[PDB]
Design a protein around this ligand. Structure first.
Ligand SMILES: COc1ccc(Cc2nccc3cc(OC)c(OC)cc23)cc1OC
Ligand SMILES: [Mg+2]
Ligand SMILES: [Zn+2]
Length: 324
């Protein structure tokens, strides 16, 4: 049920060279990948090499992998190939400022996790797939979509010549799939609120410890929520532009709920755009700020993310007060 990349596609990626100007700019949090669509695959490859070594993965294997990842993301408004790389770069940005705090294995897994975390999404939320009993909801009772993503990841590794993790030892191999699974599942916002509430308490009482595997999985968890939202952390014209993509998707869903005679939440109701600036402020306050605030206290060199998020809150507040 997968899509293998054509034999010409992955060959071009190996021939790729990143322009010097980008290399320095990538390192920044607020960096936006948007202007460089055809350069995206080579941008990931570059982030890997710089974080794991130019010889960590067989290069021929990474290229079949990456291009098979792109070819297995759907053409939906938001949960698409662009989201993959965007979310992967915020990871690489958090990693670079926190390099030693994570192991060679973790870092390998976290970058593959991000790129894959959203694999083959259909622009339909869990709410929908459970609520109206889709197959995927029956197979995966909770975190329905997340678990399909992880499975799709593994399906791609199983493809002939795609398994970039071959050279890893069987102990490490299974270890990295558990890092990846946990990470992909962590992106379910359902799980987010438990996570942030816990990590906050573990910090305030000084009881956090990075060598405590339980704690470890949760910090990784929050990094996953930070990377996943990170369009809330770019310059406002980019942020707003992505918001259009987000709602494009919600509204396509609400239309289906309407069709089956169920009033979709204001948020997915296209005939309710006036309430949007409200919802965003609600979401920034409830989710984003807390998310980045904790992740800062835990990882101080990520604070630029929390600053950008506040800037984007002022803008939304400004929209509400009729200044746009
Ligand atoms: C269920 O699907 C999503 C989950 C999370 C997001 C991330 C996101 N980014 C910016 C603003 C957001 C604002 C939200 O509430 C209004 C929200 O709902 C959970 C998610 C938001 C987008 C999504 O769009 C498809
Ligand atoms: Mg997701
Ligand atoms: Zn995502």
């Amino acid at each position: 049920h997968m899509s293998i990349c054509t034999s010409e596609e992955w060959q071009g990626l190996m021939q790729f060279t990143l322009p010097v100007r980008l290399c320095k700019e990538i390192e920044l949090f607020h960096f936006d990948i948007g202007p460089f669509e055809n350069m995206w695959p080579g941008i990931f490859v570059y982030m890997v090499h710089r974080s794991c070594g130019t010889s960590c993965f067989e290069l021929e294997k990474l290229c079949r992998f990456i291009m098979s990842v792109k070819k297995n993301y759907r053409r939906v408004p938001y949960h698409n190939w662009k989201h993959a790389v965007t979310v992967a770069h915020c990871m690489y940005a958090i990693l670079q400022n926190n390099h030693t705090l994570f192991t060679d294995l973790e870092r390998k897994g976290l970058l593959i996790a991000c790129l894959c975390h959203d694999l083959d999404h259909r622009g339909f939320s869990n709410s929908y797939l459970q609520k109206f009993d889709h197959p995927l909801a029956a197979l995966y009772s909770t975190s329905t979509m997340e678990q399909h993503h992880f499975s799709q990841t593994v399906s791609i590794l199983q493809l002939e010549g795609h398994n970039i993790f071959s050279t890893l030892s069987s102990s490490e191999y299974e270890q990295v799939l558990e890092i990846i699974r946990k990470a992909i599942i962590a992106t379910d916002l359902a799980l987010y609120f438990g996570n942030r509430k816990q990590l906050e308490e573990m910090y305030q009482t000084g009881s956090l410890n990075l060598n405590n595997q339980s704690h470890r999985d949760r910090v990784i968890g929050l990094m996953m929520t930070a990377c996943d939202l990170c369009s809330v952390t770019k310059l406002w014209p980019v942020t707003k532009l992505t918001a259009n993509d987000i709602y494009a998707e919600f509204w396509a869903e609400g239309d289906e709920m309407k069709k089956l005679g169920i009033q979709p939440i204001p948020m997915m109701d296209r005939d309710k755009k006036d309430e949007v600036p409200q919802g965003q402020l609600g979401f920034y306050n409830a989710v984003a700020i807390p998310c980045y605030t904790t992740l800062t206290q835990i990882l101080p060199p990520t604070e630029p993310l929390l600053k950008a998020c506040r800037d984007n809150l002022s803008q939304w507040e400004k929209v509400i007060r009729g200044e746009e």
